[PDB]
Ligand binder design. Structure first.
Ligand code: CHL
Ligand code: CLA
Ligand code: CLA
Ligand code: CLA
Ligand code: CLA
Ligand code: CLA
Ligand SMILES: CC(/C=C/C=C(C)/C=C/[C@@]12O[C@]1(C)C[C@@H](O)CC2(C)C)=C\C=C\C=C(C)\C=C\C=C(C)\C=C\[C@@]12O[C@]1(C)C[C@@H](O)CC2(C)C
Ligand SMILES: CC(/C=C/C=C(C)/C=C/[C@@]12O[C@]1(C)C[C@@H](O)CC2(C)C)=C\C=C\C=C(C)\C=C\C=C(C)\C=C\[C@@]12O[C@]1(C)C[C@@H](O)CC2(C)C
Ligand SMILES: CC(/C=C/C=C(C)/C=C/[C@@]12O[C@]1(C)C[C@@H](O)CC2(C)C)=C\C=C\C=C(C)\C=C\C=C(C)\C=C\[C@@]12O[C@]1(C)C[C@@H](O)CC2(C)C
Ligand SMILES: CC1=C(/C=C/C(C)=C/C=C/C(C)=C/C=C/C=C(C)/C=C/C=C(C)/C=C/C2=C(C)CCCC2(C)C)C(C)(C)CCC1
Ligand SMILES: CCCCCCCCCCCCO[C@H]1O[C@H](CO)[C@@H](O[C@H]2O[C@H](CO)[C@@H](O)[C@H](O)[C@H]2O)[C@H](O)[C@H]1O
Ligand SMILES: CCCCCCCCCCCCO[C@H]1O[C@H](CO)[C@@H](O[C@H]2O[C@H](CO)[C@@H](O)[C@H](O)[C@H]2O)[C@H](O)[C@H]1O
Lengths: 95, 194, 217, 74, 165, 194
């Protein structure tokens, strides 16, 4: 199989559904983590290491920041290589 | 109440009377919690609707002479090409999974966010059969009764094939040939001691 | 007050007016299985079904057996008839039994629900208009209605007498079948053939000399 | 022990580990003759893995000189 | 046969085992007289040994490579191949007796709890009552089940003492 | 009341006097409940009408010499072509079942929703014999008595065929030839002995 089509194709699908299908659902479940509350309430260096010091703002209308791009892109790459690797096993000698 | 599954019994309290297809059948009291029953009510309709499509599809394939429901995906294994009504299809297995996963995710994800809708209507009822909303009681009862019947039938397809290995239409023909000598009591599988 | 053993103390639970309303009450309950009133109601039904089933079965072993000896019929021994019938049969015994369990299970299930809720099978609309005649009578285990075509249960004077005859012949029939089973293993012959042997020489052909029942002797 | 002391080794109670011997059959040990799953050459489980690891696995499990699923008895 | 076993009646090792035991007995026999007391006892032992090996073969047991009978415990395998008498049937034989003993003792213990001094009825047994309960225990499975369905088999959680938690 | 089935006996109270064909025959009290009686009153007429057509069809086939009622459908299993008055019919077993099922379902479905109408009239009474109320009373009695006779007659065909293995008209001729030699007692099945 052509890696460029399969890997890019799978990544596009996983980015497309993530942006257009599961974005609303994913955000709602992320607020279920708000009900419990913040991890720590302190002002020491080690307490600062547990806070969202940097907020990743995005200009995308739906709020599809880079962290979401990395998450959904990784699933597409993972699925893409699973498809390629399995299809490679066809026509393998002594393997 | 649509009837009584066990004549002379008392209907469970937690099963509301107007619920479509309510025969009072809940031996294990799985629907006792109102929140759980609400989910179960939706799942039964969705399971039944898929079963109705599946049983109709499984019978249709063999009636028209295109094989049985079990052999349909063998082309993707042996190396042949897909066919629909005898018309060759240009896709392969890995391609098919792509369209289905994306397509079904969009539809099911859109349904999921509706928060438990089971009778949408509107665009899903173009002819307006249930637009009345008052006479829909019978149609909802007819849908669930055919849905439950289809779910039982499909389990028969899977169970029968695992025992005899023949398609649903072929099995029916074999029963009619020798009703007393060809049935579940003659598999050699269903009843070990027969 | 007739009792199975004169001079013995009848169990208290069998002397209650409810218990004495049962046919064939001779105070026989040494193991105290009927002490609980709810249990006795269930065991009474078990006896009636065992009684009636045993009478039908024994009649099907005995009457064909005598007529076979008389030459009016040709029926194998009750312990062989199963094999003989299945040969010239339209179905194997696996299929025949499976149907038997569906039909018997369905009919038995309705009888079961009437023991739990007497008269509950007359639920309007439950059957195809036939539920009206499935309510039974005021006495559990005596359905009547379609099961009494000749209406012999409508005579109040003869009612207690009829029920006693049924239980007496039923208990006798139950023991008869236990004798058929024991006499097949003990003697290796048919029931009517065993009777013929005993009548020929009663004092030498009995269980005391069959070489099985009394191993010590 | 009493049976052995009295010289009657045939009177002792030896229970066959059928449940454990049945597991070994499922993994391909053909000694017990259960012909179950990997012990049967017609099962789907036997066929699917027949090109990846079963040829090596089945060869080792049926070698009685190694400790891979030793034969068990009473 | 089952699990690689073979019927003892067809087992070579099983047959050889019988000869070994009889040979041992015969060796001791030839140091006595024909009809002396020791000789008669030894001959009686040999008869029981021959009978035992015939009975086990006749019973259709399975012998291993050791040439000793092995028992089948799975109910499905036992009923499938007629080994129900090894473990399956004796299983329900023991439970009837075990329930008999336990049920009789429980009936007696309940009976004396109503007496003025239950403790003195336990060290000093009320034999007339015990014999009465001993015979009525033959129907324990029927009585035991009916107690379970009527809900009088178990005590209430609120009437049982428990430690702090 | 039409009459009395058992002279010297009392009539059941639950059976109305004006109900056509009322002979006070209900030994088992199956119609004691009014709801049950209403359904059975319709079913008796429906059974009677079907039996009357069935008996007439069974006699017509054998009188005209085209066979007997029993062996008419053998061509399907044996393998052949259908016939009606001797003229070939192109349909086959599969085609007949499909059309019969659809037609009967539609016609019987319409009657089912009526609610239990036994004497519709109008479209079903083109000649208007039963238009007059007074005249209809006696015609209903005539219909049921002929219908009850037809129901018994058809039971005679089936029972007699099982014993003798012959058609109704063939049996009637046989009885006339040797009345004392050919009858139910002499067929070797009806009476256990002899
Ligand atoms: C009352 C039930 C009943 C009894 C006592 C028998 C007994 C017998 N059948 Mg028969 N059958 C019975 C029902 C049936 N049989 C057959 C079909 C056959 C065949 C085809 C054959 C026999 C044969 C035989 C005889 C030889 C041994 C055998 O095959 O045993 C196996 C069967 C049994 C031992 C049945 C035992 C059933 C038992 C009453 C169950 C009770 C369970 C309850 C829960 C009660 C529990 C409480 C306890 C205390 C009883 C044996 C005398 C064979 C024969 O004639 O050989 C010469 C034979 O070839 N039977 C059918 C049709 C499906 C039956 C349906 O009910
Ligand atoms: C949700 C239910 C469902 C599903 C998952 C399937 C799935 C399948 N069907 Mg089935 N089918 C269904 C319902 C279903 N069917 C129904 C309701 C009918 C009646 C109209 C049929 C009639 C039918 C026929 C006649 C055939 C199939 C065939 C197929 C296969 C190819 C489908 C294809 O390429 O479509 C392409 C999609 C479009 C053109 C749109 C596939 C296994 C084929 C098969 O099994 O060949 C061996 C085939 O010939 N189906
Ligand atoms: C939807 C109902 C249905 C129908 C019409 C059939 C029909 C058939 N089955 Mg199947 N079957 C079904 C459900 C059904 N099955 C289910 C749910 C299972 C899983 C338990 C099986 C498991 C099964 C096996 C293992 C075998 C068959 C076989 C057969 C055939 C012979 C009869 C037999 O042994 O049935 C077996 C029937 C049952 C185990 C009980 C089914 C009870 C149904 C669901 C009751 C439904 C309600 C009502 C009482 C009847 C409605 C009828 C319907 C037409 C509307 C026949 C074509 C045999 C075959 O292929 O022979 C050649 C065969 O080997 N079936
Ligand atoms: C519990 C009751 C019971 C049971 C389980 C059996 C079981 C059996 N009987 Mg027995 N029988 C019984 C009661 C019973 N019988 C009684 C009360 C009588 C009267 C005394 C007989 C008289 C009898 C005879 C004469 C014969 C049997 C035979 C048989 C065999 C089945 C025959 C068959 O295929 O029938 C299939 C048909 C049916 C089940 C439907 C009923 C058909 C009859 C003819 C209806 C009669 C209606 C009546 C006149 C009113 C089987 C071993 C036969 C046998 O041993 O063959 C080897 C046989 O020859 N039975
Ligand atoms: C203690 C647990 C235990 C275990 C590990 C086994 C193990 C086994 N049993 Mg046994 N069995 C047990 C308890 C157990 N049984 C009990 C309590 C009963 C009821 C009294 C039975 C009744 C029974 C029957 C009737 C049969 C077996 C059989 C078997 C074998 C294969 C099926 C099986 O049970 O798979 C693993 C076991 C389990 C998951 C536990 C439940 C097993 C159920 C009760 C029986 C399943 C039978 C199966 C459907 C038969 C299909 C045909 C087979 C040839 C593949 C296997 C050696 C079959 C046999 O003889 O195969 C050669 C067989 O026919 N068993
Ligand atoms: C309940 C009613 C009924 C039913 C189900 C049958 C069924 C049958 N009849 Mg019978 N028949 C009946 C009543 C019935 N008949 C009556 C009342 C009469 C007397 C008029 C006859 C006279 C009759 C004859 C003479 C023959 C049959 C035959 C047949 C067979 C073929 C029918 C066919 O293909 O028709 C096809 C009919 C049509 C396409 C026409 C439909 C009706 C038109 C529109 C009526 C116009 C007026 C079939 C077993 C035939 C047979 O036995 O073959 C072996 C045959 O030869 N029937
Ligand atoms: C049996 C079933 C569910 C049964 C549930 C039961 C009895 C529950 C019973 C109870 O819980 C109650 C109610 C109340 C409790 O108190 C008691 C119990 C007893 C616990 C569902 C089946 C559900 C079945 C479903 C959804 C089937 C769907 C099938 C499809 C889509 C098939 C598609 C295809 O077949 C085609 C068309 C062509 C082929 O080539 C390819 C494929 C893909 C195979
Ligand atoms: C149902 C029954 C028999 C049924 C037989 C049938 C259907 C036979 C059918 C067939 O034969 C035919 C016709 C023809 C054959 O070709 C085929 C078969 C199929 C073989 C017998 C029950 C037989 C039942 C018996 C014998 C039960 C006995 C119970 C006793 C004695 C209990 C005593 C006590 O319990 C009390 C009452 C009170 C306590 O306090 C004390 C104790 C002592 C515990
Ligand atoms: C006997 C019968 C019913 C009898 C009922 C009786 C005695 C009931 C009696 C009682 O209930 C009462 C009243 C009152 C209760 O207190 C007591 C009892 C005692 C319980 C019905 C027959 C009913 C008979 C019917 C409906 C027959 C229909 C036949 C048809 C359609 C035949 C068609 C064809 O024959 C052709 C024309 C040509 C062939 O080639 C093909 C075929 C298909 C075979
Ligand atoms: C701007 C814009 C746009 C566009 C966009 C784009 C074009 C994007 C892209 C994106 C992308 C393109 C992304 C990507 C990502 C990726 C990633 C994130 C990856 C990851 C990976 C991984 C993680 C891997 C791993 C691994 C390895 C390493 C080895 C083997 C195994 C595995 C596979 C697992 C649009 C028009 C739409 C809209 C408007 C705006
Ligand atoms: C061969 C056939 C295989 C079929 C495999 C099916 C896999 C299903 C994976 C589902 C993954 C989760 O996705 C699904 O989560 C929730 C339902 O659980 C839905 O989301 C909704 O669910 C909650 C619970 O019902 C609702 O209260 C909320 O409105 C919302 O959170 C998502 O919109 C849906 O997409
Ligand atoms: C044995 C056959 C198995 C296959 C399934 C059979 C289904 C049978 C359905 C019959 C339905 C009859 O329905 C009709 O009469 C009912 C009873 O008076 C009415 O109620 C309905 O309104 C009417 O439409």
């Amino acid at each position: 199989l052509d890696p460029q089509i399969v890997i890019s194709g799978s990544t596009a699908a996983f980015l497309a559904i993530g942006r257009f299908v599961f974005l609303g659902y994913q955000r709602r479940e992320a607020n279920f983590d708000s009900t419990v509350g913040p991890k720590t309430t302190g002002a020491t260096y080690f307490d600062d290491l547990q806070k969202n010091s940097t907020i990743f703002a995005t200009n995308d209308p739906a709020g599809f920041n880079i962290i979401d791009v990395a998450g959904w892109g990784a699933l597409g790459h993972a699925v893409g290589f699973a498809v390629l690797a399995i299809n490679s096993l066809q026509g393998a000698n002594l393997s | 109440k649509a009837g009584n599954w066990l004549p002379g019994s008392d209907a469970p309290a937690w099963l509301p009377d107007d619920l479509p297809g309510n025969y009072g059948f809940d031996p294990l009291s799985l629907g006792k919690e109102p929140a759980s029953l609400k989910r179960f009510t939706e799942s039964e309709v969705i399971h039944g609707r898929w079963a109705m499509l599946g049983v109709a599809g499984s019978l249709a394939v063999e009636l028209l002479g295109y094989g049985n429901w079990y052999d349909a995906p063998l082309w993707a294994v042996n190396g042949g090409k897909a066919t629909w009504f005898g018309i060759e299809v240009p896709f392969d297995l890995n391609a098919l999974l792509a369209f289905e996963f994306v397509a079904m995710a969009a539809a099911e994800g859109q349904r999921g966010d509706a928060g438990g809708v089971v009778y949408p209507g509107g665009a899903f009822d173009p002819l307006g059969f249930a637009k009345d909303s008052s006479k829909s009681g019978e149609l909802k009862l007819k849908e669930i009764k055919n849905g439950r019947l289809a779910m039982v039938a499909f389990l028969g397809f899977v169970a029968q094939h695992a025992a005899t290995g023949k398609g649903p239409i072929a099995a029916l023909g074999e029963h009619l040939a020798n009703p007393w000598g060809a049935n579940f009591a003659t598999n050699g599988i269903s009843v070990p001691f027969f | 007050r007739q009792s199975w053993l004169p001079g013995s103390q009848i169990p208290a639970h069998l002397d209650t007016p409810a218990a004495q309303a049962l046919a064939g009450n001779f105070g026989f309950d040494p193991l105290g299985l009927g002490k609980d009133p709810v249990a006795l109601r269930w065991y009474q039904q078990a006896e009636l079904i065992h009684c009636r089933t045993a009478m039908a079965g024994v009649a099907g072993i005995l009457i064909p057996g005598l007529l076979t000896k008389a030459g009016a019929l040709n029926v194998p021994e009750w312990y062989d008839a199963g094999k003989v019938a299945i040969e010239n049969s339209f179905a194997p015994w696996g299929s025949l039994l499976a149907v038997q369990l569906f039909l018997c299970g369905f009919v038995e299930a309705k009888r079961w629900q009437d023991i739990r809720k007497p008269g509950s099978q007359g639920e309007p609309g439950s059957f195809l208009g036939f539920e009206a005649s499935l309510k039974g009578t005021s006495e559990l285990g005596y359905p009547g209605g379609p099961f009494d075509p000749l209406g012999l249960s409508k005579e109040a004077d003869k009612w207690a007498d009829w029920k006693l005859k049924e239980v007496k012949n039923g208990r006798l029939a139950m023991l008869a079948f236990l004798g058929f089973v024991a006499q097949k293993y003990a003697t290796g012959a048919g029931p009517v053939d065993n009777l013929a042997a005993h009548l020929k020489d009663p004092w030498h052909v009995n269980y005391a000399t069959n070489g099985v029942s009394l191993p010590f002797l | 022990d009493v049976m052995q002391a009295f010289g009657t080794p045939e009177k002792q109670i030896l229970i066959e580990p059928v449940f454990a011997q049945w597991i070994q059959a499922a993994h391909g040990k053909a000694l017990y003759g259960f012909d179950f799953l990997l012990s049967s050459k017609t099962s789907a489980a036997f066929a699917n893995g027949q090109s990846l690891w079963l040829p090596g696995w089945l060869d080792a499990i049926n070698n009685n000189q190694n400790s891979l699923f030793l034969t068990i008895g009473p | 046969d089952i699990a690689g076993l073979t019927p003892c009646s067809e087992s070579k090792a099983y047959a050889k085992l019988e000869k070994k035991e009889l040979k041992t007995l015969e060796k001791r026999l030839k140091q006595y007289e024909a009809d002396s007391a020791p000789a008669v006892a030894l001959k009686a032992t040999m008869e029981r040994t021959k009978a035992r090996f015939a009975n086990y073969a006749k019973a259709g047991l399975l012998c291993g490579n050791d040439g000793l009978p092995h028992l089948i415990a799975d109910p499905g395998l036992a009923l499938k191949y007629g080994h129900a008498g090894e473990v399956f049937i004796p299983t329900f034989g023991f439970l009837y007796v075990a329930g008999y003993i336990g049920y009789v003792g429980r009936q007696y213990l309940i009976a004396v709890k109503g007496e003025a001094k239950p403790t003195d009825k336990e060290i000093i047994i009320d034999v007339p009552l015990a014999t009465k309960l001993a015979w009525q225990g033959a129907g324990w499975p029927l009585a035991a089940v009916q107690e379970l369905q009527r809900g009088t088999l178990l005590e209430k959680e609120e009437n049982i003492t428990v430690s702090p938690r």
